[PDB]
RNA sequence: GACGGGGAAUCAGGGUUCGAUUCCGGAGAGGGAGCCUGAGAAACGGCUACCACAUCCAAGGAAGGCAGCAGGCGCGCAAAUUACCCACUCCCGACCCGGGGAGGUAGUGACGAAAAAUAACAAUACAGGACUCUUUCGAGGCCCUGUAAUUGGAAUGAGUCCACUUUAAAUCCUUUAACGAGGAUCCAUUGGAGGGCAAGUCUGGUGCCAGCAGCCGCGGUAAUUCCAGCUCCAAUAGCGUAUA
């Protein structure tokens, strides 16, 4: 009877079509569009978004003036606003359906990272970010997959400990400092 | 459905028990007389030892023959003929050695020109037989 | 340079000692050492420096904070009397024995095994 | 205890680690039943057992050594692998006869020895309590050339399942703890088959 | 011939030739961006059908 | 460069064997004449001696 | 091939299969039988006789039941340390103070779950897309898109290893030193390439032989399917196969 967590799920679901021309195209075009690294991260995105479609299609089939359905969609377009994937003027209950993948996806720390202008392609954003450089409301990160909200767009900035925004210089600047200083005797 | 009413249950139910009961997979699935016969009493994979290396042919249309491998289970000492999978694998295995042998793919049939054996070996002296294709592990002497 | 904002203020007269919260703000600097957050916590709440006890530093992502616990005894055999002694082995204060458990389970047993006046004796 | 050994096998060296060290008292020799002590250290010039988990086939009178470096990978052991490669007066010859069984490594060796000399091949080489495997290898060595599908056993006691299911099919067991009388009996078999 | 019963003919009369040394692969997120850039992005419109990647005839 | 072989794991034992040879060596140079271990007693005979 | 339930997998709507397994209730300590004490036991880390099995012995006798924690044998397709501590959660006792293989900690650990390295940038090299003009020759390349083993400085991570931190004592995470890459050799495998089903009628060898192939079928001295080299396709630290 030891005292752990025991609870797990699968976050991501695999097609059934495991072979299709217009499919692995489309997959294909996102991952290369947005600089990811394998499909599990838009089956993963597939997956969520699936959920959220699920769960927006049971409120809408439950009838109106209840106090259950006006709770949870309420909750549902306060938390989509607060991703930022949803404005105000759309702040309905059916207009969660008209969704895409790509409202999801540009919402990626990697995208706003290319989008803002602190890196000049979506692979040397990732790469930008894996070597801890960016940080927002003074905690730097060092993940791809980080969703900003709406409020946290305009906290982006090089960090304190980075060298691109100013601090102690890295590794092969050190090194030809000293192979410098090594020529010059 | 054919008898329909309000109060009628208890024959859907029974007949549903009885439709279902004269089937074939659930019939085997659900009968301890396919287990009785089954050499391998309901498990994946079993282990032997070496009688023997003999070779059947094929069927008809293909004319090769096919070198499979005499080997008796150890948990009930039944004899069975087990074929051995790849190329030239007949002389990675010896008389009287231990194996690990498994089906073949087909929930206990024979699969293609093959006639009769439904079993493979995987391991032969504890030691994979793709190991010894691929060059990347020696067996033991 | 470093600077110290108690966090979660409380006092005790239950128990006469004072629980808070502190949060270590280094940067640039690697994890501070117990002793000397001691000394900021003597100078800072007017205290002899040898009755603050501080356990719990646990380090943030990137390294710009530090939280963990830190308590204030109003006197140092009040702080004796109730607390954990191994925080005092720690603090230098406290000596414990360093006898293993199966040495002490075999003694035991084998003082089990006899009955008398032998019992103080077959185990040493 | 904190190292690891490795010891000479039939099927080359086998890496092992060490779990015990079974001491006899000083009065009393190696051969006593369930009565012997626990040491962290041992000093030089002394018996002692070595207590292993997965060895199962040794070659004695061998030399071992220890590492107490980190040995991640068996390329260390070059020159004990050059070492059992020279002086192999025990050749295990394993073709297909008698399984035989012993106690001990030098009961096993002179049972091999006399079945050697008297020209009958031999297929097993367990060392241990007979069970109903190596009957069982019996029951496959009685088909193709049935005369050698007998185990022999000696200064050891059988299990009983592996009696019923021996004499379930007819597998005979000279089990015998006098090593002559077994020869007798092997002999007088012999004969009469 | 020889021998009909022996086995591996064709694997011990294969013309053994060793690998040639060729230049590292990359794997994790680049090769994604060069299939990327390869089916997507220096293509030409074509008539017709459409050839495979290994149609070398 | 060229001062090791054209792999790594070739190079990595090549040192702890050499390390084990000098402190097997080292172990051969400074030994004690006094106070040794003891002699191995060895006994042999015939049947019913 | 039945401990029961709360539950698990798949699932449009209905259903099908499993539930030995951490919480609840029940049963047993080889298997039947009987009982003392005690509030509460037909108790087995209590006792008494039977059989199966089994230990020591001067042979008269004496002593036991790991379906507890580690460990070993057998059985097997199939499952780990003959470790550290009562500091945390509670429990027993005359009780701040003693004890707890109940538990907590680490080791083994590709059952399974989540995040995520194996590269990015800039200039001539060479094929083109956007814009009127030179029908066709070629030019702003100021605006690009790509890749062939041309090059250049800027980066940080695995890892080695002071310290700090954690902790009963440690380990690991995080922090932090000094070192730590250009074929960044600090080199990514597992399957497949006739159709189903994404991807060569490429090049050599055997010639219904060896073999491949879940199914159609492929092998007959020009094999888009066997065996090897190059290229390519699929998923990616994961992939293939056998079974319910
Ligand atoms: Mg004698």
Redesign the pocket.
Known sequence: ????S?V?????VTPRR????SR?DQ??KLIGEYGL?????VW?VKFTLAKIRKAARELLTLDEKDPRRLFEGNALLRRLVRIGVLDEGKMKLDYILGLKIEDFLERRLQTQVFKLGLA??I??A??LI????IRVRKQVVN???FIVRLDSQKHIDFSL????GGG??????????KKGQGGAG | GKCRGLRTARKLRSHRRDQKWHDKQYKK?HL?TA??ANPFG??????GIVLEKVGVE?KQ???????CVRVQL??NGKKITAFV????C?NFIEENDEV?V???????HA????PGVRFKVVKVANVSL?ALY?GKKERPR | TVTIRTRKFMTNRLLQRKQMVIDVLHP???????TEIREKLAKMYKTTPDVIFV?????????GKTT?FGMIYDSLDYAKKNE?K?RL??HGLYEKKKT???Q??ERKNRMKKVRGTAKANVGA | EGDTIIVPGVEGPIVTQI??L?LPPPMKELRV??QYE?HKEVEAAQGVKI?G?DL?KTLAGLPLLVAYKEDEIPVLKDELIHELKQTLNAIKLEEKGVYVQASTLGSLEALLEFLKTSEVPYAGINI??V???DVMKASVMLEHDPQYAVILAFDV?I??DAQEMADSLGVRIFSAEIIYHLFDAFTKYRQDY | ?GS??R?????G???????????????????R???Y???F??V?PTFGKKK?????? | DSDDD???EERAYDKAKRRIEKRRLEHSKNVNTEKLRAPVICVLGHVDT
């Open positions: 009877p030891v005292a752990r025991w797990c799920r699968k976050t991501y495991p072979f299709e021309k692995l997959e294909l690294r394998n499909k599990r991260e993963r000049k392609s692979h040397h990732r790469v894996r070597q801890r450089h993940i791809p997959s400990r980075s060298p691109y102690r210089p890295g590794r092969v600047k050190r090194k030809n400092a | 699935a301890g287990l009785k309901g498990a994946s994979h079993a282990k094929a249309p293909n004319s090769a023959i096919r070198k150890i948990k999978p790849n190329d030239g007949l690990l498994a089906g073949f793919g087909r929930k206990g699969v293609g020109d093959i793709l691929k | 640039g600097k690697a994890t501070v050492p117990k356990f719990g530093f646990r380090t943030h992502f990137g390294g963990g954990p191994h082995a720690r293993s458990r199966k002490r389970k | 779990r015990g079974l039943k369930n626990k207590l988990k199962e241990g309590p069970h109903k495997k006691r299990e009983r | 011939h009909l019963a086995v591996g003919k064709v694997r009369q294969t013309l053994k030739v060793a690998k040639q040394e060729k230049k590292k692969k990359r794997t994790g997120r680049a090769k961006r060069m299939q850039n390869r089916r992005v220096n030409v495979g990647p290994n149609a070398n005839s | 054209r792999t790594k």
